[PDB]
Design an enzyme around this catalytic site. Structure first.
Site, PDB file in Angstrom:
ATOM      1  N   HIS A 122      -5.784   4.155  -2.517  1.00  0.00           N
ATOM      2  CA  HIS A 122      -4.492   4.859  -2.375  1.00  0.00           C
ATOM      3  C   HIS A 122      -4.196   5.494  -3.733  1.00  0.00           C
ATOM      4  CE1 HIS A 122      -0.992   5.056   0.362  1.00  0.00           C
ATOM      5  NE2 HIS A 122      -0.211   4.966  -0.694  1.00  0.00           N
ATOM      6  N   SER A 123      -4.900   6.589  -3.992  1.00  0.00           N
ATOM      7  CA  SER A 123      -4.772   7.237  -5.284  1.00  0.00           C
ATOM      8  C   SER A 123      -5.122   8.707  -5.197  1.00  0.00           C
ATOM      9  CB  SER A 123      -5.664   6.492  -6.282  1.00  0.00           C
ATOM     10  OG  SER A 123      -7.016   6.603  -5.880  1.00  0.00           O
ATOM     11  N   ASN A 153       3.544   4.033  11.450  1.00  0.00           N
ATOM     12  CA  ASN A 153       4.294   3.342  12.511  1.00  0.00           C
ATOM     13  C   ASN A 153       5.402   2.613  11.713  1.00  0.00           C
ATOM     14  OD1 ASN A 153       4.873   2.397  15.145  1.00  0.00           O
ATOM     15  ND2 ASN A 153       2.969   1.178  15.237  1.00  0.00           N
ATOM     16  N   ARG A 197      -5.434   0.161   9.232  1.00  0.00           N
ATOM     17  CA  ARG A 197      -5.340  -0.294  10.619  1.00  0.00           C
ATOM     18  C   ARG A 197      -4.356   0.557  11.416  1.00  0.00           C
ATOM     19  NH1 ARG A 197      -5.916  -5.914  11.200  1.00  0.00           N
ATOM     20  NH2 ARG A 197      -7.158  -6.855   9.510  1.00  0.00           N
ATOM     21  N   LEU A 250       6.046   8.347  -2.969  1.00  0.00           N
ATOM     22  CA  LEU A 250       7.279   7.572  -3.101  1.00  0.00           C
ATOM     23  C   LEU A 250       7.902   7.662  -4.475  1.00  0.00           C
ATOM     24  CD1 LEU A 250       8.829   5.330  -1.269  1.00  0.00           C
ATOM     25  CD2 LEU A 250       7.821   3.701  -2.902  1.00  0.00           C
ATOM     26  N   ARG A 251       7.068   7.775  -5.501  1.00  0.00           N
ATOM     27  CA  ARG A 251       7.567   7.816  -6.878  1.00  0.00           C
ATOM     28  C   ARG A 251       7.813   9.221  -7.409  1.00  0.00           C
ATOM     29  NH1 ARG A 251       4.064   3.735 -10.387  1.00  0.00           N
ATOM     30  NH2 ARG A 251       5.990   3.895 -11.638  1.00  0.00           N
ATOM     31  N   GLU A 257      -4.391   0.882   0.546  1.00  0.00           N
ATOM     32  CA  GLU A 257      -5.242   1.647   1.448  1.00  0.00           C
ATOM     33  C   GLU A 257      -5.780   0.732   2.559  1.00  0.00           C
ATOM     34  OE1 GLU A 257      -4.864   4.517   0.955  1.00  0.00           O
ATOM     35  OE2 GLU A 257      -6.415   5.834   1.696  1.00  0.00           O
ATOM     36  N   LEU A 314      -4.306  -1.949   3.628  1.00  0.00           N
ATOM     37  CA  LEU A 314      -3.167  -2.349   4.457  1.00  0.00           C
ATOM     38  C   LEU A 314      -2.773  -1.296   5.484  1.00  0.00           C
ATOM     39  CD1 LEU A 314      -0.560  -4.383   4.712  1.00  0.00           C
ATOM     40  CD2 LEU A 314       0.455  -2.793   3.136  1.00  0.00           C
ATOM     41  N   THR A 315      -2.859  -0.010   5.129  1.00  0.00           N
ATOM     42  CA  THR A 315      -2.434   1.023   6.079  1.00  0.00           C
ATOM     43  C   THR A 315      -3.552   1.593   6.959  1.00  0.00           C
ATOM     44  OG1 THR A 315      -0.896   2.922   6.283  1.00  0.00           O
ATOM     45  CG2 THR A 315      -2.619   3.147   4.637  1.00  0.00           C
ATOM     46  N   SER A 358       0.770   9.223   1.306  1.00  0.00           N
ATOM     47  CA  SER A 358       1.525   7.978   1.176  1.00  0.00           C
ATOM     48  C   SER A 358       2.886   8.146   1.892  1.00  0.00           C
ATOM     49  CB  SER A 358       1.680   7.666  -0.320  1.00  0.00           C
ATOM     50  OG  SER A 358       2.253   6.378  -0.482  1.00  0.00           O
TER      51      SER A 358
END
EC number: 2.3.1.122
Lengths: 280, 280
Positions: free
Chosen positions: A258-259, A150, A231, A38-39, A226, A228-229, A122
Site C-alpha cells: 500500500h504505497s 465495502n 480480500r 487519507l493523509r 494491502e 487486509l484490503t 487507498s
C-alpha cells in the site's frame, strides 16, 4: 514559453466558503482527476509529491487535475463539521468535484465537465467508484487502486473511524453518521455495484498482495494494509461479475504494498486504456 | 548493589534444541518476567532497548528476567516450524518459560519457580494472561499492556496472521493450526477468563485510546493499533467482571499509543502492586 504547463489554481467553493487549491496540467478537453489518500496535505496532492504523474501524462491528449486538501474527507459531502478537531466548516467535496470545480474548469481552462476519469487510491479508491456510480456522465471511467470497497460492512466502519481520527482527528460520525445511517451504504462501492453495471462504467480495480517487489514500499504498515484490503477487492470483482458487470479490469498481481510506487505503476499501466475510452 | 551487574545468560532449551539468551537482574527470590512485543530481536529484549525497566526495578526486592528472541512467537508452543520463512526448528516458548528457564534460574540463581509475575505488551499481553491462566502457581500475577485479548474471535485470526507474516514472515497456522483448531480458543484470554477467576489471579490490564501525550509515540500505526485493541480490552474488562472477577486493575486513561513510553509508564505504575502481591 515554459516546459510542462503545470499550474497551481485557486478555485472558489461556495459550498465550503473558501478557495480550494488545485494543481493542473492542461492537455486536452477531457481530464484525469487524480484523487489523494487519507493523509492529503494542504500544500500539494500526493500524486505530485510521490510520483512522476504529470510527466507521465504530459502530451497524452488528456488534462491532469490534482485537487489539493481534504485530509480524511473521503471526497464526500459530510453531514456536519468534524466534531472534535475544531473544523470550522463542513466538507462538501462531492459538491465541489461534481459541480463547482468542473464548472470553473470549463469556464476558465476549457476542460469538459463530461467524459472524464476519476482515479483514486487507498481512501479515494472507493471515492472514485462512488463518483462514477452517481455521476456517470462526468466519469465514464473510474479507477480504484488499493481502495476500501465495502466500507459499510463488518469491522470497516470502525476501522475507517479509527484511521480518520489518526489522520487529523476527523470524526466519521460527522461524515456519514453512525454505521446504521443510510450514508454508509450510499457510499459503499460494493453496495453500489448495480449502478456501475447499469451505467456500464469502465472500471479499473487494483490491489496488491502485500509482498514488495523491486519498486519498494517495504514497510509493515504498507504490507499490512494491502493484505487486509485484498480480500474485499476480490469479493468486489466476484460480485461485480455476478451482477452483470462487464466493463472492468481487475489487476491482483502476486506483489505490491500500500504505497505510491505501485499506484504510480498502475497509473502508467492504465494510460492507453483511458486514452481509448475518453478520446477514442 | 542488589542483583548487579545486569547479566546476559545463555539458557539451554532442550525443546527448541538451542540456547536462549536471557538478560537478568537479580534482587530477590521472586521475579518479573518481562515479555517482548511482536518484533522481538535476537540481541536484546525491547524493554531494555526502549525503557529504563532494569533501573526502575533495581532495589525493588524483585529479580527481573528479560528473555531475548522469539519474534512473532506469542511466547507459545507452536505445532511446527513456521511454514514460509525457512524456520528450521519449532518454537516451544511456553515450555521454555514454564519449565526450562525456571528450572535453570532456580538451580543457578535461587529464583523461585513459583510466585512470580508475567508482564507482557502488544503480542505478549495475551501471552502473560494465558501463562497465568494455565500456570497459576508460577504466575499469581499477570499484566497485559495493550494486548490482543480475543485472538480467536471474528477478524482477529486474520489480522494476527497478517501481522505475523509482516514481522518476519511467520505463519500463524504453523503456530496454532487452522482457526478451527482447539489451540486458538485455548490461547484466547477472553475465553480463559474463567480460569483467571478460578485461580484468583491478580491481573493488571492496560490499554490507551490512541491519543498521544508528551510521552511521544505520535505516529499513525501506533495510534491506530491502540484504538483498535482498546475495544477488545473494554470487552475483556466487562466479561471479567461478569464472570465474577474481583482481582483486577483496569487502566484505560484517555491517552496513549501502541508504543514503549506508555508501556514503561505502566511498568513503573505497577511496581508497588507487584511488590505487595509477590512479597507481601
Amino acid at each position: 514559453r515554459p516546459g510542462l504547463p503545470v499550474e497551481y489554481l485557486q478555485v472558489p467553493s461556495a459550498s465550503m466558503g473558501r478557495d480550494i487549491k488545485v494543481q493542473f496540467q492542461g492537455g486536452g478537453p477531457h481530464a484525469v482527476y487524480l484523487l489523494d489518500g487519507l493523509r492529503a496535505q494542504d500544500d500539494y496532492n500526493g500524486w505530485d509529491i510521490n510520483t512522476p504523474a504529470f510527466e507521465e501524462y504530459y502530451q497524452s491528449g488528456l488534462s491532469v487535475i490534482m485537487p489539493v486538501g481534504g485530509q480524511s474527507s473521503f471526497y464526500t459531502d459530510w453531514y456536519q463539521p468534524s466534531q472534535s478537531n475544531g473544523q470550522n466548516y463542513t466538507y462538501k467535496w462531492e459538491t465541489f468535484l461534481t459541480r463547482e470545480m468542473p464548472a470553473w474548469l470549463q469556464a476558465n481552462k476549457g476542460v469538459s465537465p463530461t467524459g472524464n476519469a476519476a482515479v483514486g487510491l487507498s481512501m479515494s479508491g472507493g471515492s472514485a467508484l462512488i463518483l462514477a456510480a452517481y455521476y456517470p456522465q462526468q466519469f465514464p471511467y473510474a479507477a480504484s487502486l488499493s481502495g476500501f470497497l465495502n466500507p459499510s460492512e463488518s469491522w470497516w466502519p470502525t476501522l475507517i473511524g479509527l484511521a480518520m481520527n489518526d489522520s487529523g482527528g476527523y470524526n466519521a460520525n460527522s461524515m456519514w453518521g453512525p454505521s446504521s445511517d443510510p450514508a454508509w451504504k450510499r457510499n459503499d462501492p460494493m453496495v453500489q455495484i448495480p449502478r456501475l453495471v447499469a451505467n456500464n462504467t469502465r472500471i479499473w480495480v487494483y490491489c496488491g498482495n502485500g509482498t514488495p517487489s523491486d519498486l519498494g514500499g517495504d514497510n509493515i504498515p504498507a504490507k499490512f494494509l494491502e493484505g487486509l484490503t485484498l480480500r474485499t477487492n476480490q469479493t468486489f470483482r466476484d460480485t461485480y461479475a455476478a451482477d452483470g458487470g462487464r466493463n472492468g479490469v481487475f489487476n491482483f498481481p502476486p506483489n505490491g504494498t500500500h504505497s505510491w510506487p505501485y499506484w504510480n505503476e498502475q497509473l502508467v499501466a492504465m494510460k492507453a486504456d483511458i486514452q481509448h475510452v475518453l478520446n477514442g
